[PDB]
């Protein structure tokens, strides 16, 4: 019966809430009370990549710390070389509505997608459309290579999918969200991944299966960004709520909230700093903010753009940070 299931669901929700509440003996604000502050973080624009002719929507680094791929809404996907300002590749897309980028961990391939509901995989040979995966019913919002023959995509039809690039078939489908899925992050071991949706929630999925293990809530609006802590035990959430939130997997609840009274803009991306001691978040007010992740204190500000900050990324070695923007400028700070 309808009531026989509704009451059981409500009871389960209440029991879970009580169980997770009876576990917060302390908070991640009293333990780190005596931790010394990181001080003042000041960064200088080391490079300015200046190739795109329209807004930039995505960006990725690749496990090299030298080259990065950027996508803009002018039908071009540019692969640069950070140490210089050179352009290594420029790929023309069949559709100029792109909102995602991905660099293969091995550096051979790249991927893109957007309002055409198709994930296009290009082969760099290190140029030519190697594959075109089409099984979604909504605009793609993220994609992340697991290997040279596997990829995880997230669409606006409220679903994620794990593909098989060799054959193009949808190996697995992850459902459960009740709104558009706007981001996803792969765990360092690539055995689990988190996804943040427009229903103001995040979910933890097992890649080897198709089941959601935990659901995290607390945000008051859509979530636009997601990031994993370097050891794979926690994650960060970026939303329009202007409240950066850190959550833990083992404790299964929220730990800290990063917000200020003078910030009203939404957050369009988040990222860590190779140690988890800094959290960099891009905002709609053309600014990027560096927070002390352990004390929730605004350590610093980066301000070099003038239209928005739609993509933020940190080098694997945490050497530098590339910041692409709708102003068609990729600023690399150090």
């Amino acid at each position: 019966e309808l009531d026989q299931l509704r009451q059981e669901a409500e009871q389960l929700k209440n029991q879970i809430r009580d169980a997770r509440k009876a576990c917060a003996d302390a908070t991640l604000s009293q333990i780190t009370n005596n931790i010394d502050p990181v001080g003042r973080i000041q960064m200088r624009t080391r490079r300015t990549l200046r190739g795109h002719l329209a807004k930039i929507y995505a960006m990725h680094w690749g496990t090299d710390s030298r080259l990065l791929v950027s996508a803009s809404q002018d039908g071009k996907l540019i692969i640069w070389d950070s140490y210089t300002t050179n352009k290594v590749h420029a790929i023309p897309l069949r559709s100029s509505w792109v909102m995602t980028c991905a660099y293969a961990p091995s550096g051979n391939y790249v991927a893109c997608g957007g309002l055409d509901n198709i994930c296009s995989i290009y082969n760099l040979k290190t140029v030519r459309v190697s594959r075109e995966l089409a099984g979604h019913t909504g605009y793609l919002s993220c994609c992340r290579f697991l290997d040279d023959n596997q990829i995880v995509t997230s669409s606006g039809d409220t679903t994620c999918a794990l593909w098989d690039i060799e054959t193009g078939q949808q190996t697995t489908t992850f459902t459960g969200h009740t709104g558009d899925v706007m981001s996803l992050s792969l765990a360092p071991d690539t055995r689990l991944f988190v996804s943040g949706a427009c229903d103001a929630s995040a979910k933890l999925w097992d890649v080897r299966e198709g089941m959601c293990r935990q659901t995290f809530t607390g945000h008051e609006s859509d979530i636009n960004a997601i990031c994993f802590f370097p050891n794979g035990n926690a994650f960060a959430t970026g939303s329009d709520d202007a409240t950066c939130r850190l959550f833990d997997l083992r404790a299964d609840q929220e730990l800290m909230t990063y917000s200020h009274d003078n910030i009203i803009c939404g957050i369009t991306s988040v990222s860590f700093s190779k140690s988890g001691r800094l959290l960099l978040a891009g905002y709609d007010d053309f600014n990027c903010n560096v927070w002390d992740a352990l004390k929730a204190d605004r350590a610093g500000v980066l301000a070099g753009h003038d239209n928005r900050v739609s993509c933020l990324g940190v080098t694997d070695d945490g050497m530098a940070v590339a910041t692409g923007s709708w102003d068609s400028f990729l600023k690399i700070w150090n």
């Binding site: 669901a9 908070t27 991640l28 370097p230 083992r250 700093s273 945490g318 530098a320 150090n334």
Partner: protein, 56 residues
Amino acid sequence: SIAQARKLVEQLKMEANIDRIKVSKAAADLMAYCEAHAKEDPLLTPVPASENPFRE
């Protein structure tokens, strides 16, 4: 709907059987990890020139 409510109840039941570690045992781990990798973070403690890739 007897088809969606059953799935919702099953999912809720499957997520309430997980073992949870006490808070202040997961914040301590985060603090320890942040402390053990302090010297390997060029953004926290900047590296001297001639070691920065983008000195120019």
